[PDB]
Design a protein around this motif. Structure first.
Motif: not given
Ligand SMILES: CC1(C)CC(=O)N(CC(=O)N2CCC(N3N=C(c4ccc(OC(F)F)c(OC(F)F)c4)[C@H]4CC=CC[C@H]4C3=O)CC2)C(=O)C1
Ligand SMILES: [Mg+2]
Ligand code: NI
Ligand SMILES: [Zn+2]
Length: 329
Positions: A6-7, A10, A13, A26-27, A30-31, A35
């Motif tokens: 996942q990192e 991220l 992106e 999306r950030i 994913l974070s 964000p």
């Protein structure tokens, strides 16, 4: 010592961090709803701000996570995603060719820090609402730029939490100059100051001077801080200049916030504020009006100041305006 998957997604992106149009939502996903922390951290590394200001990395991360936690995840617009967006947009504006090598590292730090804190602990209602409800915030700040005063006070106060003082290695002179600029910038985000900021930006365009390889000449604090104030104010008013998929989400969010306020005003017998009435709304017509009377006039003047750097931004704005105009029944 390797990123998790996942990192990694991220980090991929975050390679768009220098681009207008970064997928900030999306950030956020994913974070893990971080964000602001991940975008700030990326930007600080990119600009070498940790080395320049001797910011210990654990302190930076601790501060950023604390700051991000004082934004409300239950406010639809004025949350940590908006803060992250304004930071990233400011960061892109600061990189414009017309401003290459114009601003010092301390000025850069000011603009980015200001962006990060500029709406912290926002309750999702307007200054006028806080004033008219006799809220504690309004009383504390004597009805004057209530929210913006509060955002500043919280952003600075958080530096006193455990291992949060990111400015601990700055000299007193650096801290005083930084603090003054940050205050001047955040206070300029109060929309009641918009007409004065824009008037001054216009005056500056009319008397524009260019110099060191064709970049702007700003030779006094008043001009330097006006540019930074308008820059962050542009970033704050940047939603209609982004790709329609981003812009529309921002519109949905601000409308949700506005309509919730209007519901609270209706339930209490108050006059319902401009565009807070979900039973008497014209979302599309309101965006066109917001663009025509506020966003375009500002961005057009900014585009003149930095000509031709902001042409694609202004074109996107004009395209989005036509799109909203075209959906009007
Ligand atoms: C001129 C009209 C035809 C249309 C109109 O706007 N108003 C209200 C009005 O002029 N104002 C001034 C701006 C205020 N305001 N508005 C924000 C905002 C953000 C994103 C928006 O949409 C989309 F980009 F997401 C948005 O769109 C919608 F309002 F149009 C408004 C924030 C800007 C900066 C700081 C805090 C937020 C703030 O203070 C709200 C009051 C009219 O009365 C008529
Ligand atoms: Mg604000
Ligand atoms: Ni909350
Ligand atoms: Zn804002």
């Amino acid at each position: 010592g390797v990123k998790t998957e996942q990192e990694d997604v991220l980090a991929k992106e975050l390679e768009d961090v220098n681009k207008w149009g970064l997928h900030v939502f999306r950030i956020a996903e994913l974070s893990g709803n971080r964000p602001l922390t991940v975008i700030m951290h990326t930007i600080f590394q990119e600009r070498d701000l940790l080395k320049t200001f001797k910011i210990p990395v654990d302190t930076l991360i601790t501060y950023l996570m604390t700051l991000e936690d004082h934004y409300h995840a239950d406010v639809a617009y004025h949350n940590n995603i908006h803060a992250a967006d304004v930071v990233q947009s400011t960061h892109v504006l600061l990189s414009t060719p017309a401003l290459e090598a114009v601003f010092t590292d301390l000025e850069i730090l000011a603009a980015i820090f200001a962006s990060a804190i500029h709406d912290v602990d926002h309750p999702g209602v307007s200054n006028q609402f806080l004033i008219n409800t006799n809220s504690e915030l309004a009383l504390m700040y004597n009805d004057s730029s209530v929210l913006e005063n509060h955002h500043l006070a919280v952003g600075f106060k958080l530096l006193q939490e455990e291992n949060c003082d990111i400015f601990q290695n700055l000299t007193k002179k650096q801290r005083q100059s930084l603090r003054k600029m940050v205050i001047d910038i955040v206070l300029a985000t109060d929309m009641s100051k918009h007409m004065n900021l824009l008037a001054d930006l216009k005056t500056m365009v009319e008397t524009k001077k260019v110099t060191s390889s064709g970049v702007l000449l700003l030779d006094n604090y008043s001009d330097r801080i006006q540019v930074l104030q308008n820059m962050v104010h542009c970033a704050d008013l940047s939603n209609p200049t982004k790709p329609l998929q981003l812009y529309r989400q921002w519109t949905d969010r601000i409308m949700e916030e506005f309509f919730r306020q209007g519901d609270r005003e209706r339930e209490r017998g108050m006059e319902i504020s401009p565009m807070c009435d979900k039973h008497n709304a014209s979302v599309e017509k309101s965006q066109v009006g917001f663009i025509d009377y506020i966003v375009h006039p500002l961005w057009e003047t900014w585009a003149d100041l930095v000509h031709p750097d902001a042409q694609d931004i202004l074109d996107t704005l004009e395209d989005n305006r036509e799109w909203y105009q075209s959906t009007i029944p």
